[PDB]
């Protein structure tokens, strides 16, 4: 609940921690999400959308 | 307002710069030190800090001396460096509390927006914690004195994000990390009742000295709650708690039989080996 | 035509500068600046250490701004700082701590005053946590490359020297480009307040604060903790019930690369926390 | 505490994360190219919208 | 050239403002300031100039440096509070001056006194025992009176000025509707 | 190898093999050189003289520091000693070489002369504050402070330790209040006790150096307690190798109990201890013919560690001599010795330094001259002591090893019946 798996667009996997600041509620799995080169902390999601939604 | 606060050590072996560069002149006073933090967030964090040529005089404690250009010129190079910090307040080395620090702040205050006070010592004797947070409010007081200054204690915490604590622990190679078990409790659950007796015996000397000899009111209001949580507990009995013995002294015999039936297992490659391979070795030795 | 051997005293002054511009040492190239007292041939002793104002150009010598080096060195020469620079640090992230030729000429132009010209490469990016060794570079004189490379004496702490033994970068370039030893200093005022600095990091303000949580904290969180040791420990015993015959059968050879020992003693460490802090309980109940 | 961000794309096909920064934009924030960037930041400094698929940009340059 | 530095004290009370001296004299001895560190600059630029005022909490308005285009606009928003304070007013330049940058530039401290003194003669002569000790170049002006002009500050200032070769002098300017800029300028100080 | 024969004609080959470099390679080839001749008041002298007596300016002054430190090696214990000329030669004044190789050659020449005209010029020496000049003045302090202890020397020199940011005049006048301890059992208790929590690593160290010498012949029984104490529960190695040698220092007595308490140190934690521990079965069994160390020479031998193959081809070097093949199978460690110099290309380059500096043990003075850490009646040689402590002490200053001649003891007899 803690730590989970991040998949890149680039291709390559990794695993990430959780931030003090945000909550489990974005947390799950399903919604994509934005990470940091260093130390791979998560600062906030990304919603997505499609090129006609736009 | 604010809750608690995050000081780095590395204002604090600052402080030791600033105990390296005195220069052996014989002066040593409370060399006041711009403190550099980050007020966006309710936590404050100090990252770094920097010093300004602070001199006062002998007999008046009224002088004081600040410098406008160079705060000006170091925190505006230092915001150029790095513009995620900005100014927060000051503190000073000495120990004791003076009137003129009201002055000092004062400036601080008009400039710069609320500084929190940070009071430590100069020789690292005290086994208390050497940075308290000192708020810089003025508050309403109920006898009806005039409202001032007031000093605030902020609880502080020591702590470092990434690097800082890599360089303690290299630069130490002698202090040990969490290690629970026997040790790292038991020196805790030994020296705990000197950091205890030191801290109690340190300061009801001088209360008690201040109770007959004090004058200046020294705010007795607080006393009286003072006191009455001395007094929340009245030597309690212990005849309703005597259950709860009997919950502690249980969970008490949980790990005596964890104890002795996991070392009675423990007790098997031992007790087996010792003479499987003695007599084995023995047998075929020759 | 003479060479010393020189080792690079490192206080914790440079060293958390060095941590807290590694902090800052983004990907874009940084630049920092060295001083310190030049006492004789073979010691050098670093003081003061600052940050540098990033550029895009990067490292190099057109990003040294003289005026403003020598307006911030003049305001630390007013002030109790009265030493001379005696290097230049930066930070080369991912592509290793080499010097590349930009760097080497701003270095053979760097050392035109001081003939010492310490240079300092830290790198935190791609180091692990647990070490922070870092290392000293110097530059060698070209006309040197007839006679011996490296006329030093005091060949002992060489071997200290070797260890930063990558295979690529030490030996993959050291010609024309060697290092230097590192060692540190502490004096008592920085043992006991940095000591009992970090001691008190790692304890409570009055240090009778979190005691009681824990102890009381035994009857109400740590029996989930204390259920479930005892879970992982049945859950072992189902296996050690079938040991005694694999040991009644073989008795030559280990296998199984699991003691089954220590973390059963590991346990019984974690459960004697309630036999320590009960005296702990019956001193917070007597006075 | 606003909400604000864009998605970005690189020549090399790296997607990367970055909200929308610079300076006053006014024809800015359109699905465009040729944008300001540094060498690792990757931030957005100056804009600029292109072209390519020159056989239809260069049709008839007539001045 | 000369290498030393220059300390100016100004009034800030409601004593500046009468109408039978000159049409709120702030501004006069403000330019008097501006020609005497425009006179200094001319002889030599790199004389350092702070300015500080002698109220109850002294506030160092700027720092002592040669560079006066900001110093021109400090010489603005002069808080008209407070009426006088002298001995934190000598004691929060005096004992200052080690501050300064250059080590070489001689100690010279003025002040412009609009208001009558408070400290009684004990005080006079423990400062003026305590300049005189120290041997700092101090030159008292005093604008405007209610009492006789100087009847203890004669002696404060014989007792306060050493080295009678090329010392100190005392400026004293009497009632008049003459600007005071060609007044105080009249000794060897201003030149 | 070629010590008291005075045999310069190895070196009368050629002269592009010497001075072919200009560092103290040269000073360490002199000093080598008053290594080889010894006990000449005519030759000695005109020897130095006679290298360049042509313009009296020495291009490269290590000859002129090289003479004097080589002179005070000839003139060592010596009743004609030319120290009254020393001072006359020492007033003048010169760049580091009179003062190092002047301060070096003049205190070993007044060792146990207990002279205060030397305490005073060698003060008034290492008043400069430099590390090199006060590193010899130390150890030149040392050597002619046998047995004297003064009052306000020790507080002079421990007051002076801590006054300044130097290491090697920290292990200068670490070894300079080390060796004038002296007979001083029942006296340095509470200093050594008093100095032993020191927050100086180096101070440290010299608190254990210093208490070496002072308990010699295995009198104290207390002393091992801080000793291997501060060998296990210090964090810092410096004292961790620079502990045991108090420990072979005051076990010298008995050769066999000596590899049963080390044999832990052996193959210790760090390599730090395996090296100092190397040196402690080095110093414990030289001259004598016990096994035990020698059957634990083979782990020692092979690691990839530099410092304990170094420490291990010494301490192998310092059993092997004087005895015979016959009586012991040596086949093991002579070939593993031999086989050093021809594996150098792939070895390191100080495992070599010390490989070949083991092999020169061996052959020193042709097998004729040995080692003795004891004389015949079981008193111990003062100078043997000195010059196996400062022949340990190469690993800070290599040039430091010179001082083993003093501890060459020659092994034969003696018919004398006449003078002439
Ligand atoms: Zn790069």
């Not at chain 2, 109770?211 to 009111?217: F, H, Q, R, W, Y």
């Not at chain 4, 699905?31 to 008839?60: C, F, H, Q």
């Not at chain 6, 002393?223 to 420990?247: G, K, M, Q, T, Y």
């Amino acid at each position: 609940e803690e730590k989970f798996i991040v998949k890149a667009t680039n291709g390559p996997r990794y695993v990430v921690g959780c931030r003090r600041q945000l909550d489990k509620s974005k947390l799950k799995p399903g919604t994509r999400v934005a990470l940091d080169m260093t130390t791979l902390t998560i600062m906030r999601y990304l919603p997505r959308e499609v090129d006609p939604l736009v | 307002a604010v809750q608690k606060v995050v000081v780095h050590p590395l204002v604090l072996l600052s402080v030791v710069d600033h105990f390296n560069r005195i220069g052996k002149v014989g002066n040593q006073k409370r060399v006041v030190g711009v403190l550099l933090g980050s007020w966006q967030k309710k936590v404050l964090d100090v990252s770094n800090s920097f010093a300004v040529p602070f001199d006062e005089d002998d007999k008046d404690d009224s002088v004081w001396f600040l410098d406008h250009d160079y705060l000006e010129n170091m925190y505006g190079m230092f915001k150029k460096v790095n513009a995620r910090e900005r100014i927060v307040g000051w503190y000073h080395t000495g120990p004791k509390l003076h009137k003129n620090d009201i002055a000092i702040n004062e400036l601080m205050k008009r400039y710069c927006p609320n500084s929190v006070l940070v009071i430590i010592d100069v020789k690292p004797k005290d086994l208390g914690l050497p940075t308290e947070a000192y708020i810089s409010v003025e508050e309403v007081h109920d006898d009806g004195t005039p409202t001032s200054k007031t000093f605030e204690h902020v609880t502080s915490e020591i702590g470092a994000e990434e690097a800082e604590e890599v360089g303690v622990e290299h630069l130490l190679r002698d202090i040990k990390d969490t290690t629970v078990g026997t040790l790292s409790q038991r020196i805790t659950n030994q020296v705990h009742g000197l950091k205890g007796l030191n801290s109690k015996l340190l300061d009801i000397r001088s209360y008690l000295e201040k109770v007959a000899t004090g004058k200046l009111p020294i705010n007795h209001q607080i006393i009286y709650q003072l006191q009455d949580v001395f007094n929340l507990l009245p030597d309690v009995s212990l005849q309703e708690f005597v259950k709860a013995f009997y919950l502690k002294t249980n969970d008490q015999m949980v790990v005596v039989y964890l104890a002795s039936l996991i070392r009675s297992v423990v007790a098997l490659h031992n007790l087996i080996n010792n003479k499987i391979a003695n007599r084995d070795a023995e047998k075929k030795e020759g | 035509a003479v060479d010393t051997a020189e080792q690079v005293y490192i206080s914790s002054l440079a060293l958390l500068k060095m941590l807290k511009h590694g902090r800052a040492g983004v990907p874009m190239e940084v630049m920092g600046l060295m001083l310190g007292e030049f006492v004789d041939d073979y010691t050098v002793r670093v003081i003061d250490v600052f940050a540098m104002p990033q550029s895009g150009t990067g490292v190099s010598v057109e990003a040294v701004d003289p005026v403003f080096q020598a307006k911030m060195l003049d305001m630390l020469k007013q002030t109790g700082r009265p030493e001379m620079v005696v290097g230049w640090y930066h930070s080369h992230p991912g592509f290793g701590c080499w010097l590349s030729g930009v760097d080497i000429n701003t270095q053979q132009s760097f050392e035109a005053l001081s003939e010492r010209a310490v240079a300092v490469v830290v790198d935190p990016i791609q180091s692990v946590k647990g070490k922070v060794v870092i290392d000293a570079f110097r530059l060698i004189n070209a006309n040197m490359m007839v006679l011996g490379h490296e006329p030093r004496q005091t060949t002992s702490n060489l071997g200290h020297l070797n260890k930063p033994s990558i295979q690529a970068l030490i030996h993959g370039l050291n010609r024309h480009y060697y290092s230097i030893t590192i060692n540190y200093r502490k004096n008592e005022l920085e043992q006991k307040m940095l000591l009992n600095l970090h001691k008190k990091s790692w304890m409570e303000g009055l240090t009778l604060q979190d005691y009681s949580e824990h102890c009381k904290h035994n009857e109400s969180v740590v029996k989930e903790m204390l259920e479930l040791a005892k879970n992982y420990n049945k859950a072992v015993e189902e296996e050690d019930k079938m040991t005694p015959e694999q040991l009644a059968i073989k008795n030559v050879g280990k296998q199984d690369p699991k003691r089954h020992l220590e973390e059963h003693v590991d346990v019984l460490m974690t459960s004697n926390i309630v036999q320590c802090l009960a005296a702990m309980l019956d001193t917070v109940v007597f006075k | 505490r606003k909400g604000k961000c864009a998605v970005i794309k690189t020549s090399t096909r790296q997607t990367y994360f970055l909200p929308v920064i610079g300076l006053v934009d006014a024809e800015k924030l359109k699905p465009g190219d040729l944008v300001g960037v540094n060498k690792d930041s990757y931030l957005i400094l100056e804009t600029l919208p292109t072209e390519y698929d020159s056989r239809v940009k260069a049709m008839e340059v007539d001045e | 050239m000369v290498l030393e530095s220059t300390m100016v004290c100004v009034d800030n009370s409601e004593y500046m403002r009468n109408g039978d001296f000159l049409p709120t004299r702030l501004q006069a001895q403000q330019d008097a300031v501006n020609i005497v560190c425009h006179s200094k600059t001319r002889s030599n630029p790199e004389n350092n100039v702070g300015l500080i005022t002698l109220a109850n909490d002294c506030e160092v308005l700027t720092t002592l440096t040669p560079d006066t285009g900001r110093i021109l606009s400090k010489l603005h928003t002069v808080q008209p509070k407070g009426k006088i304070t002298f001995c934190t007013g000598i004691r929060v330049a005096h004992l200052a001056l080690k501050h300064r940058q250059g080590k070489n530039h001689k100690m010279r401290i003025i002040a412009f006194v609009g208001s009558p003194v408070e400290d009684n003669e004990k005080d006079l002569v423990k400062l003026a025992k305590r300049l005189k000790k120290e041997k700092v170049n101090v030159d008292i002006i005093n604008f405007g009176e209610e009492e006789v002009n100087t009847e203890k500050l004669t002696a404060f200032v014989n007792t306060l000025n050493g080295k009678d070769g090329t010392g100190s002098h005392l400026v004293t300017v009497p009632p008049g509707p003459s600007l005071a800029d060609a007044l105080i300028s009249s000794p060897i100080l201003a030149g | 190898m070629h010590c008291g024969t005075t045999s310069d004609q190895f070196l009368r080959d050629n002269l592009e093999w010497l001075a072919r470099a200009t560092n103290w390679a040269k000073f360490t080839a002199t000093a080598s050189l008053g290594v080889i001749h010894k006990g000449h008041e005519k030759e000695a002298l005109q020897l130095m003289a006679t290298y360049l007596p042509k313009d009296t300016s020495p291009g490269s002054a290590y000859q002129e520091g090289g003479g004097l430190y080589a002179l005070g090696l000839i003139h060592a214990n010596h009743g004609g000693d030319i120290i009254d000329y020393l001072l006359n030669q020492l007033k003048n004044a010169s760049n580091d070489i009179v003062r190092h190789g002047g301060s070096l050659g003049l205190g070993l020449a007044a060792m146990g002369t207990a002279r205060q005209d030397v305490y005073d010029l060698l003060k008034t020496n290492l008043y400069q504050d430099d590390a090199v000049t006060g590193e010899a003045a130390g150890l030149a302090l040392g050597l002619v402070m046998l047995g004297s202890k003064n009052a306000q020397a020790i507080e002079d020199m421990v007051g002076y330790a801590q006054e300044t940011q130097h290491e090697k005049i920290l292990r200068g006048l670490a070894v300079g209040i080390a060796l004038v301890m002296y007979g001083r059992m029942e006296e340095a208790d509470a200093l050594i006790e008093s100095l032993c929590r020191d927050k100086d690593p180096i101070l440290r160290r010299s608190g254990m150096y210093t208490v070496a010498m002072a308990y010699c012949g295995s009198g104290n029984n207390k002393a091992i307690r801080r000793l291997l104490h501060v060998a296990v529960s210090d964090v810092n190695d410096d004292v961790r190798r620079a502990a045991v040698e108090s420990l072979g220092f005051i076990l010298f007595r008995t050769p066999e109990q000596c590899p049963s308490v080390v044999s832990l140190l052996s193959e210790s934690y760090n390599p730090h201890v395996r090296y100092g521990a190397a040196m402690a079965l080095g110093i414990c069994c030289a001259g004598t013919g016990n096994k035990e160390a020698i059957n634990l020479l083979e782990p020692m031998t092979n690691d990839p560690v530099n410092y304990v193959r170094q420490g291990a081809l010494i301490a192998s070097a310092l059993i092997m001599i004087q005895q015979t093949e016959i009586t012991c199978p040596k086949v093991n460690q002579f070939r593993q010795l031999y086989s050093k110099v021809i594996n150098d290309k792939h070895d390191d380059v100080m495992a070599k330094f010390g490989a070949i500096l083991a092999q020169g043990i061996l052959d020193a003075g042709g097998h004729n001259v040995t080692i003795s850490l004891q004389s015949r009646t079981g008193h111990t040689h003062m100078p043997s002591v000195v010059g196996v402590l400062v022949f340990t002490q190469f690993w800070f200053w290599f040039p430091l090893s010179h001082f083993l001649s003093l501890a060459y003891t020659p092994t034969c007899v003696i018919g004398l019946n006449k003078d002439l």
